[PDB]
């Protein structure tokens, strides 16, 4: 339940929001979080849920905090406090100047250059999966495409066997949406337990895979340590297994419910890139933050050192003061504003890989199965957390309206 209110917190700023189980969850997870943006709610509130933590509710506040790493440190970036204290992935748990040097190395395995070179394989995997489903006329998109497409692309790049997916997927989820069987520390260590033997074997006999590059990598001329590689590889695992997988579900759900917007893409393919950006805004899904490094007065609110402050990357784009008709999906929006991939020194290094994956999915799915919808009488349940997702997305379509395309 609720944590006792700290001495310095004003009772008029208390809004008991629960990020792992928001009250208005059945209306759609993004809709649940938007309640923090209704007229009466202040720009910065305090929830007593999950141990108690501040919550910036507007883009202006969120963007500001992410830029000011001096007052807002990534050292303890997650809610609750035990999860953030135990979290030490690189570069996410570091602030500049220390974190900068590690980004370049990560870019060596997921940056635009590597992505450009993966295009052929990515499109090839997307098409096989889709054509594999096209004749059945149904599928549960979460397990049939959303998880396999991105995860297999990563497992491949990482030189990790596909049979290890179920185990790894489970562990990453305990970090973003814990079912209660594991603490944050336990899941993290279980992941490290998996990676350690591999980072050691890749440093003895390195291959060309992602982990080999990282384990034998150099940051600012000096060679990376075994511990650092572990912490960096753990972050890459989470990105390939619980980011795009969740996003594709939100996107296909919307498309399933809006024959209008899909038709807009089928008829005018060139706008798919722009459509992707708008879908990333409307269905943003990440929510992490920072921890106060000192007593600081922020927008009239007294914050004390050690206070945690959630800065939901998902809210900036939904903020009416940033986009005129927030909950409306308009592919022709002239200035699609958002912070879906973060803001500041920690801007997502995988976003380029993310976009190609989203764009390839839209182009290769719409080209084969243009007509489809939500299964008969199914009510789509969303899941909330550090990274929100879709519990299940069963779809259906008439095989006769589909077309077998050749890649
Ligand atoms: C649609 C999918 C994705 C979303 C929305 C997303 C979101 C984010 C966000 C918001 C951050 C910054 C968080 C913070 O400020 O603490 C971030 C960091 C990062 N992301 Fe992603 N990401 C996505 C996919 C990926 C993928 C697929 C990978 C790689 C396989 C990845 C790798 C990274 C890395 C390495 C960082 C750390 C950068 C740093 O610490 O400076 N992300 N991502
Ligand atoms: C805060 N991050 C942004 C993308 C993934 C997310 C995250 C979630 C769990 C563990 N590490 C990172």
Swiss-Prot record:
Catalytic activity: 2 reduced [2Fe-2S]-[putidaredoxin] + (1R,4R)-camphor + O2 + 2 H(+) = (1R,4R,5R)-5-hydroxycamphor + 2 oxidized [2Fe-2S]-[putidaredoxin] + H2O
InterPro entries membership: Cyt_P450, Cyt_P450_B, Cyt_P450_CS, Cyt_P450_sf
Main location: cytoplasm
Class of this enzyme: oxidoreductase
Location in or out of the cell: Cytoplasm
EC number from the UniProt entry: 1.14.15.1
Alphabetized Gene3D superfamilies for the sequence: Cytochrome P450 (1.10.630.10)
Cofactors demanded by this protein: heme
PROSITE patterns linked: CYTOCHROME_P450 (PS00086)
Positions with a binding annotation for heme: 348
Cellular-component GO terms for this entry: cytoplasm
Task of the protein: Involved in a camphor oxidation system.
Family: Belongs to the cytochrome P450 family.
Protein name: Camphor 5-monooxygenase
């Amino acid at each position: 339940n609720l944590a006792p209110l700290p001495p310095h917190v004003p009772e008029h700023l208390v809004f008991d929001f629960d990020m792992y189980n928001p009250s208005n969850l059945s209306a759609g997870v993004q809709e649940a979080w938007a309640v923090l943006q209704e007229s009466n709610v202040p720009d910065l509130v305090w929830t007593r849920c999950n141990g108690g933590h501040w919550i910036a509710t507007r883009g202006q506040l969120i963007r500001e905090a992410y830029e000011d790493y001096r007052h807002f440190s990534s050292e303890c970036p997650f809610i609750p406090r035990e999860a953030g204290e135990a979290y030490d992935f690189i570069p996410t748990s570091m602030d500049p100047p220390e974190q900068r040097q590690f980004r370049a190395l990560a870019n060596q395995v997921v940056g635009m250059p590597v992505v450009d070179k993966l295009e052929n394989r990515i499109q090839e995997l997307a098409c096989s999966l889709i054509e594999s489903l096209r004749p059945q006329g149904q599928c549960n998109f979460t397990e049939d495409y959303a998880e396999p497409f991105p995860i297999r692309i990563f497992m491949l790049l990482a030189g990790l066997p596909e049979e290890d997916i179920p185990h790894l997927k489970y562990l990453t989820d305990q970090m973003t949406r814990p079912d209660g069987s594991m603490t944050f520390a336990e899941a993290k260590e279980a992941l490290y337990d998996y990676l350690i033997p591999i980072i050691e074997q890749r440093r003895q006999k390195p291959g060309t895979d992602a982990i080999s590059i990282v384990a034998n990598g150099q940051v600012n001329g000096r060679p990376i340590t075994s511990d650092e590689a572990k912490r960096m590889c753990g972050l890459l695992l989470v990105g390939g297994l619980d980011t795009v997988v969740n996003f594709l579900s939100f996107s296909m759900e919307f498309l399933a419910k809006s024959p209008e917007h899909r038709q807009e893409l089928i008829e005018r393919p060139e706008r798919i890139p722009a459509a992707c950006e708008e879908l990333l805004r409307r269905f943003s899904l990440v929510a992490d933050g920072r921890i106060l490094t000192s007593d600081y007065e922020f927008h009239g609110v007294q914050l004390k050192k050690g206070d945690q402050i959630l800065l939901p990357q998902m809210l900036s784009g939904l903020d009416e003061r940033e986009n005129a008709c927030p909950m409306h999906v308009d592919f022709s929006r002239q200035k699609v504003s958002h912070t879906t991939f973060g803001h500041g020194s920690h801007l997502c290094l995988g976003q380029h890989l993310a976009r190609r994956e989203i764009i390839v999915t839209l182009k290769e799915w719409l080209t084969r199965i243009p007509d489809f919808s939500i299964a008969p009488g199914a009510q789509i349940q969303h899941k909330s957390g550090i990274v929100s997702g879709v519990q299940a997305l069963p779809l259906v379509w008439d095989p006769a309206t589909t077309k077998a395309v050749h890649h």
